[PDB]
Design a protein around this ligand. Structure first.
Ligand code: DLP
Length: 203
């Protein structure tokens, strides 16, 4: 991750650039919308998120976005989660819970956060990139996501909460049933955002 990247994540934050291609809404909650672009050739999706979470100190949200020990402790969908230093960077191992029948999914990736000073504004930016390691091979039963990348940008909304922007894409290793998206959309996330807020107030 360079300088380049971190600032790039901030842009759409300032301005949602969706005009480009066939984006589409999907959901709006707690002051947050989720757009998605479907790559017609691969069937893969590309998500984009904006919104405002009042009651979330831009500073907390970020801390909490890096705190595994705690995250592990409150995020109902986290089966396993841990960090290790590899060379000079921090590699994350995360195992996500999928409804049985579906295999859970697990990620190995390089994560990194930097708090930017653009215009005397503290913009907490974090980047994620899948990566690999000899000693941490794929697991049986669990589907290893080898293509995955995400960036999240946080900032004060001026009031009590925060204004944010997020990019996400990963290749899940299998077909994601539209009912799962519907759940995700209609219940999953809403509640997640909820449980999370609760999680900031109780930090
Ligand atoms: C509303 C429309 C729904 C769109 C469909 C989404 C997912 C469908 C695919 C699988 C769903 C199976 C169930 C999983 C539980 C979902 C509950 C949830 O929603 O669990 C929050 C979590 C965000 O993971 P993470 O970013 O905390 O780190 C993630 C690190 N690893 C990528 C390694 C995990 O979901 C995940 O991973 C799952 C990947 C989806 C990411 C794209 C949508 C973003 C959704 C929520 C986050 C939005 C706002 C808050 C985030 C911070 C705000 C500053």
């Amino acid at each position: 991750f360079s300088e380049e990247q971190f600032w790039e994540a901030c842009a759409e934050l300032q301005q949602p650039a969706l005009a480009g291609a066939d984006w589409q809404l999907l959901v709006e909650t707690s002051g947050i919308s989720i757009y998605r672009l479907l790559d017609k050739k691969t069937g893969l999706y590309e998500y984009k998120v904006f919104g405002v979470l009042e009651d979330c100190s831009p500073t907390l949200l970020a801390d909490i976005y890096m705190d595994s020990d705690y995250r592990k402790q409150w995020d109902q969908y986290v089966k396993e989660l841990y960090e290790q230093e590899c060379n000079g960077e921090t590699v994350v191992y995360w195992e996500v819970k999928y409804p049985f029948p579906m295999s859970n999914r697990d990620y190995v990736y390089l994560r990194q956060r930097r708090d930017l000073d653009m215009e005397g504004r503290k913009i907490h930016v974090i980047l994620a990139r899948s990566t690999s390691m000899p000693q941490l091979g794929e697991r049986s039963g669990v589907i290893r996501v080898k293509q995955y990348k995400q960036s999240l940008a946080i900032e004060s909304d001026g009031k009590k909460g925060s204004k944010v922007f997020m990019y996400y894409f990963d290749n899940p290793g299998g077909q994601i049933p539209s009912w799962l998206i519907n759940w995700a959309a209609k219940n999953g996330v809403p509640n997640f955002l909820k449980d999370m807020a609760r999680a900031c107030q109780n930090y």
